[PDB]
Amino acid sequence: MAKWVCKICGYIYDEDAGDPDNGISPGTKFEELPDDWVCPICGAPKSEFEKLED
Ligand SMILES: [Fe+2]
């Protein structure tokens, strides 16, 4: 699946990894993250992520 970078801090939201410590199972697409999910490192909103693809 896809990876996304937090443009603030460099955390990678890896869709294959999810974010289970914060309620997100492995395999959850970025679009499906709740609107108020934030970067688990720096707290940035979803708007601050960029998908790592051309
Ligand atoms: Fe971040």
UniProtKB/Swiss-Prot annotation:
Residues 2-52 form the Rubredoxin-like domain. Gene3D superfamilies: 2.20.28.10. Binds 1 Fe(3+) ion per subunit. GO terms for molecular function: electron transfer activity; iron ion binding. Fe cation binds at C6, C9, C39, C42. CDD domains: rubredoxin (cd00730). SUPFAM superfamilies: Rubredoxin-like. Extremely thermostable, being unaffected after incubation for 24 hours at 95 degrees Celsius. Keywords: Electron transport, Iron, Metal-binding, Transport. One of its GO terms (biological process) is alkane catabolic process. Its cofactor is Fe(3+). PANTHER family: RUBREDOXIN, RUBREDOXIN-1-RELATED. Belongs to the rubredoxin family. Rubredoxin is a small nonheme, iron protein lacking acid-labile sulfide. Its single Fe, chelated to 4 Cys, functions as an electron acceptor and may also stabilize the conformation of the molecule. This is Rubredoxin. It comes from Pyrococcus furiosus (strain ATCC 43587 / DSM 3638 / JCM 8422 / Vc1).
